[PDB]
């Protein structure tokens with residue numbers, strides 16, 4: 310500290326004692342109001358790809374783990390975001406699009422792809438941020454007679470724009486002559502039936518597809534992953550993260566009666582002195598961990614190399630140990646004799662070298 | 670021919686290269702070196718056209 | 719089914735020291751805290767509106783400015799909520815706050831609002847709006863118009879959030895804007911994120927069954943918040959018991 314190899318006799322304030330943080334405590338509100346993924350990925354009836362079902366998702370917690378464990382998935386391809394980071398990401402809106410297609414066309418549900426499904430039934434934009442999930446649905450959607458309730462659009466005048474749906478049943482006019490709204494040669498009804506049967510090849514078996522599209526807007530993002538309760542440890546110096554307010558301190562019991570709308574608490578000098586726990590509605594007195602001014606009492610290096618340490622303001626139980634009003638003095642022995650002051654300690658206590666003695 | 674590391678357990682340090690072609694565990698279930706559910710390959714190729 | 723039924727008259731009164739709210743969610747005890755925020759100035763000009771329906775369009779839409787202080791001495795059933803937005807038609811988003819006997823429904827959709835919107839009593843919203851499309855927000859909670867009693871609200875639209883503050887202060891024969899301090903507790907911080915420039919009060923009308931609606935009257939006070947610096951007194955229990963407006967008079971300026 311003194312930037313010299315020889316130290317003159319005296320007391321030098323050299324360092325600051327600190328109580329190191331031991332554990333990390335993160336307290337967040339109870340997980341609840343989970344997003345209804347269980348009503349999207351487990352529905353009694355799915356929808357035809359032409360009339361694909363869209364559910365808007367907002368104002369809820371997104372627990373993607375239930376989506377992960379719902380079924381074995383033929384594809385869980387995620388475009389523009391990794392699947393794992395989703396829980397730690399918060400999005401403004403999540404759109405869940407549900408439909409049934411044949412297995413061969415699952416590859417078509419991706420950005421930049423072409424086919425009957427991509428051009429005429431469901432289109433994803435080139436810059437799409439989201440995930441595509443598909444799983445086999447033979448038990449739910451296959452009948453031996455043939456399931457004729459799943460339809461697709463085979464004929465359309467122009468390609469679909471991204472996130473567009475056409476429900477029109479208008480007869481597709483492929484020829485110069487007007488159709489007149491009655492089926493006729495060169496006039497074909499656009500919606501064809503997916504005649505699913507249990508004995509079809511894997512390419513043609515029915516597959517249920519849910520497309521999750523995540524969008525961020527200027528509005529505050531209200532769909533974010535789970536919040537970890539962790540656990541609450543009191544009476545020790547732990548790094549606390551309470552509802553995004555971070556710090557480091559002991560959390561003692563509080564006698565302060567907060568009003569119901571208040572969450573934190575502040576000192577006269579605008580320093581946090583209290584907090585309300587989100588998990589349990591209790592008030593805790595945040596008190597920062599102990600600190601002290603480490604002062605080194607030493608005679609000249611010409612005479613001796615013994616030193617004594619004064620922890621300024623620190624009681625002796627919180628760190629040849631003597632308790633002074635200045636702080637805790639370690640390394641000097643109190644003598645009931647009184648001499649003149651050699652090295653000033655404070656509060657009437659002075660130190661001298663004879664070993665190092667401390668006296669009034 | 671150009672691949673990127675989609676998955677890794679931790680972030681890399683400056684000027685560090687990772688070429689380990691080991692499987693990544695994305696879920697609670699261990700993967701045991703075989704791909705399948707919630708087990709994905711870390712290296713994915715770019716669709717350059 | 720938009721019908722013009724409400725006529726409105728206006729007078730001017732004094733704000734006294736009404737309109738103070740808690741500027742944040744921080745517990746402060748036995749301190750003097752100076753904050754600069756959108757507050758209703760002390761002894762300011764507040765407009766008293768009387769809305770009368772007897773059994774032409776004479777109920778215009780009020781501006782919102784930087785936030786609105788609302789007060790009413792009426793019972794909880796006559797005034798049933800508010801409307802917020804810019805154009806108040808199907809082209810922009812709008813916020814509808816409707817209270818009833820059991821709960822409050824706050825809902826942000828693309829409402830095609832009527833010129834004179836009112837809830838008619840079952841309860842029907844066909845006289846409030848004709849259509850509501852592309853609805854993006856809904857929030858149902860316990861009501862804040864429950865049961866002589868002066869009800870005060872402060873609405874702010876700051877950085878995407880529709881901050882609503884409220885207080886229920888009983889009053890006697892004394893004028894509807896009383897003396898003393900009643901700090902407004904932060905009630906609902908709605909994450910809306912829409913543009914709000916105009917607002918209108920919603921009233922409830924009963925069918926007559928005999929002049930299709932029963933005659934009624936409602937009195938309410940509207941004041942406008944301004945960027946002002948206040949010095950609030952926090953007592954031992956964290957309640958704001960007193961405040962001084964720093965720009966009102968030299969004595970309060972010295973205090974601030």
Ligand SMILES: *[C@@H]1O[C@H](CO)[C@@H](O[C@@H]2O[C@H](CO)[C@@H](O)[C@H](O)[C@H]2NC(C)=O)[C@H](O)[C@H]1NC(C)=O
Pocket residue numbers: 818819820821823840841858
């Ligand atoms: C008061 O408002 C609530 C909320 O809008 C009404 O309760 C809903 O009534 C509808 C009837 O269309 C039900 O489908 C909902 O399930 C109810 N929701 C809740 C949360 O209860 C209530 O009916 C209204 N009461 C009156 C008298 O108008």
Ligand SMILES: *[C@@H]1O[C@H](CO)[C@@H](O)[C@H](O)[C@H]1NC(C)=O
Pocket residue numbers: 347351
């Ligand atoms: C999912 O579907 C199966 C099929 O019957 C049902 O048994 C199960 O309860 C469903 N789970 C949920 C969470 O809906």
Ligand SMILES: *[C@@H]1O[C@H](CO)[C@@H](O)[C@H](O)[C@H]1NC(C)=O
Pocket residue numbers: 339587588589590
């Ligand atoms: C949160 O969870 C705790 C512990 O289960 C419970 O006591 C409390 O009522 C819950 N709700 C709130 C709002 O704290």
Ligand SMILES: *[C@@H]1O[C@H](CO)[C@@H](O)[C@H](O)[C@H]1NC(C)=O
Pocket residue numbers: 730731763
């Ligand atoms: C309030 O405003 C009106 C017109 O805006 C004005 O005539 C009236 O004098 C004002 N009130 C006071 C107390 O000045």
Ligand SMILES: *[C@@H]1O[C@H](CO)[C@@H](O)[C@H](O)[C@H]1NC(C)=O
Pocket residue numbers: 851852
């Ligand atoms: C609003 O509604 C119209 C028709 O109801 C629709 O064309 C438009 O895309 C909608 N916009 C949004 C943002 O939902």
Ligand SMILES: *[C@@H]1O[C@H](CO)[C@@H](O)[C@H](O)[C@H]1NC(C)=O
Pocket residue numbers: 804805913914915
């Ligand atoms: C809010 O609406 C008003 C009235 O139409 C308009 O003048 C103003 O520009 C709008 N603000 C924004 C940010 O769009």
Ligand SMILES: *[C@@H]1O[C@H](CO)[C@@H](O)[C@H](O)[C@H]1NC(C)=O
Pocket residue numbers: 953954955
């Ligand atoms: C504050 O709380 C205490 C303890 O409940 C109570 O006795 C006192 O009346 C309250 N008000 C004031 C102004 O101290």
